[PDB]
Design a protein around this ligand. Structure first.
Ligand SMILES: [Cu+]
Ligand SMILES: [Cu+]
Lengths: 251, 139, 50, 50, 301, 51, 42, 50
């Protein structure tokens, strides 16, 4: 956390701090990304909502996913909403589990496994070629998208061969990405939802109103036996405050 | 009310030539253009790949580039063209946002994206002129 | 425009320093507008000129 | 007399705003997605001769 | 006319524009078509299949609504789908199969040489002869990690197929923007009936939303704001109408008075051929201002 | 917390939540407690009597 | 401005015309309808 | 100690505008406890098993 004197232009502010951020990017590891905070202050959290399933049909892992790519994108459109934070759920994780006896038997080092893994999930092209009058674009498969596909990865390959397939040293199963935050609703159970955050200084009432109008529209596209319960709505205190004092003054 | 200006006809004239000397210099020195800037307010984020395809140019680069951008302040639309070779992303703000402030804000999340795209790819911040900007074409 | 304007005036006033009155009357009004645009920036696009 | 204008105000000829004249001209077509780079530089020389 | 008639050729529809306005035209990522429907989607299949539903519906819903789901898809492509199993038997990382699809087949630059404040690029590829055609390409020579000499066909199936010429997207998500439009009618009434109609009998696939745009979004703010301005502009006007002589009778009369003048004015348009744009509105404003002046000075007399 | 007859909705966040604001480990239990309007459901019982 | 244009007058016309036509029409209006309307207003 | 014992992600797969992560680790059974961890199987550069 970086702090300035009161009343420094907030945007000027964040711009200055950013100055030396670029100098730092190359000095930290790959898995590490340095992120500039949202735009709203701590006060910013407005509309908290949860994503429950009415039944069992829709998967816990499936929800976090539903809220992450479809929803978070619908609600980041509204004018003054800064970022829409996702909470809870499970992150669908393609998981390759190695077996120490299998490795030994084939003498394929972990480094060997990681090197091919990084090396078999990429897609590329190579210019066009003037067949007919039109030039046809040249492309080539390469992305993963089948568990079976994870299996058929090559490790130890030989001529007049046979080869070792990843399926020969690991069990590839979809799992739940190590959890770093768990959203829940009552006894209703573990449930992922998203928090809405208000880009500093902008009528919270207005933003929420917009959000409530978006969610009403979306429920139409929602799956079967799942709904958007509002967990919290800053709006109401906004209201309750206004009605109370508006009535006082007349009185 | 008008008459209070006649007790000093000299005043308005000397006032008037204040306008004369001042007039001639403000009007003449100033910029002359045909048409008004009116593309809109935006940053033109271009990326460059030598040769590929739309599935891969979007998947590989403009995905990293459009997605980080949704979050930057002032962004109304993060719409962009992605195509064989290059990936242009256009970011739009409300009218009259300070243009330089503007481009500065968009840049905020550009650094986050540089490491996530391939080597051959460089994400370029548009020029400074608007579409109107093209003046002198020579061969 | 100014001379034609002035010519017409002359006919309706049988001549006069109307032209002089014209150089004072409109050129200064043009001048104030030129100043004001500068205050709020803007470009001297064809219409501003139009 | 006002009725006479209502006639024109309801019909109002047609077309809105002006397409302004610049001393030069830009030629841009609806062109088809895929073509050779060879054919392109060709179907441009010809175009620049016609 | 002479030009558009002079240069005629196939596949080429001729459009002629002035410099400034044109260059302005290519950056503004705008949808000219008065109306336009942005259909957001998680995957392309949903949005495009849906996009055609809107061609038929735009045509049926009263209005000369020309609907084009997408003029996009029109690229021709060569699809090298790499057979991981057949590449595996040869112990090739898909990465390396691609090495022949990228550097060899196409020719990605592999470095640039300096000549002082200069920098020209270095290209590394198989000869023209091995890239001439899909067939030439089915026999691409690949030299395996085990010096096993082979052809691209052994490691993958190369087919041909039409595809995306370009991809447009609204906010990281792929959305097809259809261009539907009628002309010279404020299509505000044409949108709502259409939006409910689609909602009643044509359904959207889960993981998808839909929005409209173009000009339509424009007027509602402008027109509405203009209309508000006529009360605002009149109310401030009346106050400044009976200020010189004190009484509202005259203020009433000025309002009755201007429209007549506008009348004689517009009528000039027909004479010369001029059409009414915001420019004529601006003219009109000038006219109303000048007549109001005399009304005041003449009333005093 | 749900037992309490005054409370309406409850939401359990035990960790951080995808915003650079929330900096909460997994021991950090933060639950938003929506409180039912006051015609419901109790006499006496004040906000502080609730706490 | 109405019968000639070297460069950039397609716009002025649109705003100009209303004045001429309205100005054959506006003065006439003044000549006649200040009185008739004032004596009718009382 | 990193990929095997814990399980740092080694890549993310695309499913269009989606991106789920890939984890590569030794089974639960070899990470259960410090003891389970004192016997972590390491296969040396010389196929020396330890
Ligand atoms: Cu098999
Ligand atoms: Cu806390």
């Amino acid at each position: 956390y970086v702090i300035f004197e009161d009343g420094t232009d907030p945007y000027w502010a964040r711009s200055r701090v950013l100055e030396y951020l670029n100098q730092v990017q190359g000095k930290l590891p790959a898995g590490v990304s340095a992120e500039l905070g949202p735009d709203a202050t701590g006060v910013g959290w407005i509309y908290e909502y949860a994503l429950v399933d009415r039944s069992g049909k829709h998967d816990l892992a499936d929800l976090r996913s539903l809220q992450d790519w479809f929803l978070k994108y619908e609600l980041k459109t509204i004018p003054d909403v800064a970022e829409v934070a996702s909470v809870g759920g499970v992150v669908k994780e393609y998981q390759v589990v190695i077996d120490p006896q299998r490795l030994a038997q084939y003498g394929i080092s972990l480094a060997e496994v990681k090197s091919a893994l990084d090396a078999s999930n990429q897609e590329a092209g190579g210019s066009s070629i003037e067949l007919a009058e039109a030039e046809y674009m040249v492309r080539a498969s390469g992305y993963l998208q089948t568990l079976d596909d994870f299996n058929h990865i090559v490790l130890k390959a030989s001529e007049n061969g046979v080869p070792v397939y990843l399926r020969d040293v690991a069990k590839v199963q979809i799992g739940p990405e190590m959890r770093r935050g768990i959203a829940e609703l009552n006894g209703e159970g573990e449930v992922a939802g998203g928090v809405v955050i208000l880009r500093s200084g902008k009528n919270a009432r207005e933003v929420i109103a917009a959000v409530k109008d978006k969610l009403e529209t979306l429920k139409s596209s929602l799956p079967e036996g799942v709904e958007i319960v509002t967990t919290y709505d800053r709006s109401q205190l906004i209201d309750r405050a206004i009605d109370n004092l508006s009535g006082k003054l007349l009185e | 009310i008008i008459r209070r200006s006649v007790a000093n006809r000299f005043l308005v004239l000397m006032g008037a030539l204040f306008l004369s000397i001042w007039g001639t210099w403000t009007i003449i020195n100033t910029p002359v253009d045909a048409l008004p800037d009116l593309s809109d307010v935006q940053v033109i984020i271009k990326t460059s790949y030598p040769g590929q395809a739309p599935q891969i140019v979007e998947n590989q680069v403009t995905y990293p580039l459009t997605t980080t951008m949704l979050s930057v302040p002032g962004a109304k639309t993060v719409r962009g063209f992605s195509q064989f070779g290059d990936s242009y992303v256009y970011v739009i703000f409300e009218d009259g946002t300070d243009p330089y402030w503007a481009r500065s804000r968009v840049l905020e999340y550009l650094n986050q994206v540089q490491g996530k795209l391939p080597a051959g790819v460089s994400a370029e911040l548009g020029p400074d002129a608007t579409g109107v900007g093209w003046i002198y074409e020579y061969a | 425009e100014f001379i034609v304007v002035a010519v017409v005036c002359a006919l309706f006033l049988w001549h006069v320093r109307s032209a002089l009155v014209a150089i004072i009357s409109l050129p200064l009004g043009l001048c104030i507008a030129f100043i004001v645009m500068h205050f709020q920036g803007l470009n001297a696009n064809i219409m501003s000129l139009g | 007399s006002v009725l006479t204008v209502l006639w024109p105000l309801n019909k109002v000829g047609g077309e809105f705003l002006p397409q302004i004249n610049e001393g030069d001209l830009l030629y841009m077509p609806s062109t088809l997605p895929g073509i050779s780079a060879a054919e392109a530089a060709s179907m441009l020389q010809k175009t620049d001769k016609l | 006319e002479e030009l558009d008639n002079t240069v005629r050729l196939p596949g080429l529809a001729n459009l002629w524009v002035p410099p400034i306005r044109n260059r302005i035209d290519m950056l503004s990522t705008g949808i000219k078509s008065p109306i336009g429907i942005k259909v957001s989607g998680t995957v392309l299949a949903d949005i495009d299949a849906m996009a055609e539903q809107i061609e038929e519906v735009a045509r049926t819903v009263p209005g000369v609504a020309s609907a084009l789901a997408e003029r996009l898809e029109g690229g021709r492509y060569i699809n090298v789908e790499i057979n991981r199993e057949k590449a595996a038997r040869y112990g090739m990382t898909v990465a390396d199969v691609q090495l022949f699809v990228t550097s060899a087949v196409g020719g990605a630059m592999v470095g640039e040489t300096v000549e002082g404040i200069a920098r020209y690029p270095i290209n590394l590829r198989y000869p023209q002869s091995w890239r001439d055609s899909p067939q030439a390409l089915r026999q691409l020579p690949i030299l395996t990690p085990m010096k096993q000499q082979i052809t691209l066909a052994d490691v993958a199936d190369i087919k041909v197929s039409t595809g995306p010429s370009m991809l447009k997207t609204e906010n990281a998500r792929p959305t097809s923007w259809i261009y539907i439009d009628a002309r010279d009618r404020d299509m505000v009434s044409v949108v709502h009936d259409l939006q409910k109609a689609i909602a009643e009998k044509v359904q959207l696939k889960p993981g998808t939303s839909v929005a409209f745009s173009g000009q339509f979004e424009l007027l509602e703010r402008a027109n509405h704001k203009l209309k508000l301005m006529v009360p605002m502009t009149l109310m401030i006007i009346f106050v400044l109408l009976y200020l010189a002589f004190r009484r509202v009778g005259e203020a009433l009369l000025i309002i009755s008075s201007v429209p007549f003048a506008l009348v004689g004015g517009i009528w000039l348009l027909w004479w010369m051929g001029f059409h009414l744009s915001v420019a004529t509105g601006t003219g009109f404003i000038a006219l109303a201002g000048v007549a109001a002046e005399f009304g005041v000075v003449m009333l005093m007399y | 917390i749900m037992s309490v007859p005054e409370v309406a909705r409850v939401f359990g966040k035990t960790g951080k939540a995808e915003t650079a604001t929330d900096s909460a480990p997994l021991e950090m239990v933060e639950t938003t407690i929506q409180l039912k309007p006051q015609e419901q459901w109790r006499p006496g019982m004040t906000m502080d009597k609730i706490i | 401005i109405l019968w000639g244009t070297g460069a950039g007058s397609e716009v002025m016309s649109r705003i100009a015309a209303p004045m001429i036509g309205g100005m054959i029409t506006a003065p006439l209006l003044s000549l006649f309808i200040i009185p008739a309307a004032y004596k009718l207003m009382w």
